[model samples]
Target: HHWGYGKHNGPEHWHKDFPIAKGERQSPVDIDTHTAKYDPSLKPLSVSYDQATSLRILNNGHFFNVEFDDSQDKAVLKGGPLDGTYRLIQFHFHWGSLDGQGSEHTVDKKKYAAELHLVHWNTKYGDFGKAVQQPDGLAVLGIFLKVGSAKPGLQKVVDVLDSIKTKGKSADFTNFDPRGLLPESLDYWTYPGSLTTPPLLECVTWIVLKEPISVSSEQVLKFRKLNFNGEGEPEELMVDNWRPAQPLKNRQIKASFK
Candidate 1:
């Protein structure tokens, strides 16, 4: 469920009605690198760039939903060098108000420019949604998006944003491979956790990459310009579509290369 601040949609009262709406794991909090443990076995299997896997583009008036083909052999995120494969499912972005300050995860209580979530599920178990409820059914790979040189990889995605710039508008995206968006470094931090959003299922095994991908300031603005409201005659602008940081709740976050 989407949570934000607005009349009747404020954070405080939003979850009250949806009693089962608690996330076992929440994000946007600092990783506290100083206190987390690491393991080298938790490395990516093989990251690739495919032009045909780009599926659909959704202009939610808040952020772009870039759906990619997860049916590729290279899209696998092996639990470890010798572990089972978790295939990519869907990915989306999170942002804040015009001032470039709102994001789900924070560093030292400070928000980053933006955040990207690459959702994946362990096909070995069952369907993506079903797997999300298991302790290790999901694997969310996170990468920070900071303003800088227009990373060529990101251009592939940004180039299509204009096609669906309006709320609820979506266009078919072909010849695009999302693997290209990943940073060069395979280094990442892994841990046991839950989904950052509702149902708060604690079955996720998160792998947050150590490096970030570069996106031009203009690209960042394009995302900020998105209208949170739905599109067309009955359009509803999507202003601040972010969830407040949830309590760590005695959870321990571990890294892969401490």
Candidate 2:
């Protein structure tokens, strides 16, 4: 609708409808590596995922989402600035048309080719809908993707893009483990922030990995092959489905490693 990455409905115009778009804790901020404070107290992040919980993949007009069955704690994220367990709900990516820079969050103004978001909701908050309204209701695991060697896990997801080429298109994608998509190291920068996209709820405890995963140029091309418009509509390339880095404001980003 009017909340996409188009010039008229982009980040600059979001605050007109969602006042919190300009809030103090907005997400996708430039993670200033120089200023990140090392926090030894922050424990190593623990992530457990079950492949059976993987349900399907679809193009949701904005991005291709890999939905999971969050009805139970089959897949959960713990530790690393989290209070309790947060169940995994879904995971998606943000990319550009050509792959120069497409990631939402930047490291010292350095943008990655793409960024992966693994979304989870705090169990205490009940569900994702209600959790978005609470301050500590969500925990998102962010991983930057640099164009290089093809990642096996990422390739699996890319292979299915041809099936869901248009908005509202979906296909069965089961028995996939997202744990394979993560980097070897879990070192991260933690902060309190909001959702990068619309609704812009300031409920996320962002844990962005310091180590970036690798993907091939060919795989990223498949992502751009998706369409923002539905069938029979004029083709609108689903490129640059990412918001620019927002202001850091009064917040401080904590680094797990020095």
Candidate 3:
């Protein structure tokens, strides 16, 4: 059966639904790079935003996806922490309806309530879709979210959630720089992985920030209240929109400063 949820609703169980799942690589696991002993010289390229990039918003019933056309922006990486130029393709988020949990990446077997994924591609890759196909072509910056009294860095994004509260609704956001949404610290954990979704192509370089952004309990609830079903209809509320955690297999996850 093509069941989307259940105890068996995870990347591991996917094989039961489709044979292709066996060939896929899942994510949200510990990347134990200390054991693999690979080359440490693979540096991140730098990126720059010269012109005002364009933003395209999509209210895909479950969550909001803000895509940026940053052909003019440049990003280049060398060694480790040298910045200059790379293009920002798009950024999206994952959230749950209640506080205390919703993200895909778990820490010590605990799930955060929300997570944001900022996707970028090397200009050398030519296109975002094409970049996603390369083993080292895509860089995904991840931010975690927890419930608190403090406003999350996502306030800018949540401000528009009410406007596009229905499925298929969309809006254009301008005069906003994604850098503003980043946490104060740039320290992160990096690893080679695949898209958390299906197709599971092992082509992503994940950079998950250590510091988590905070969000109000209500803000998280708002996300839970959203529905991908449709508008003006009694649609199913979006409560748990996250995919289950993936297996570690034989991977090596590396923290930036460890």
Error of 2 at 57 (Å): 0.8
TM-score of each: 0.83, 0.98, 0.81
**Model 1 — which ten-residue stretch has the worst lDDT?**
43-52
For candidate 1, give the lDDT of residue 141: 78
Collision pairs in model 2: none
Encode model 1's per-residue lDDT on 1-258: one tens digit a residue.
455456575656656764534544555356667776675545544543333366788976546787767665446666442246677767888766553555666554666677788877787776776787677787777887777888676776677776776777898976666766778786766666666555556777767777878787887776765665665655454446666666766677666665
For residues 1-258, what per-residue lDDT tens digits would candidate 3 score against the true structure? Answer: 433333556445766655535444556564343443333554543334344464767777656788776666533222342222346667777766566667888766677888888777656777778877777776677888888765654576777777777778888886556666666676666667767665566767777777888777876777766666568888777666666676666566666654
User: How accurate locally, in lDDT, is each candidate?
Assistant: 0.66, 0.92, 0.65
Tens-place lDDT digits, model 2, residues 1-258: 468898978888899999999899999999999999999999989898854388999999999999999998899999989999999999999999866799999998999999999999999988899999999999999999999999998777988999999999999998888988989999999999999998999999999999999999998888988999998999999999999988899999999999
Against the true structure, candidate 3 reaches a TM-score of 0.81
Give the residue spans of candidate 3 off by over 4 A: 1-20, 30-54, 74-86
Cα RMSD for predicted model 1:
3.1
* Residue 52, candidate 2: C-alpha displacement in angstroms: 5.2
Candidate 2: regions farther than 4 A off: none
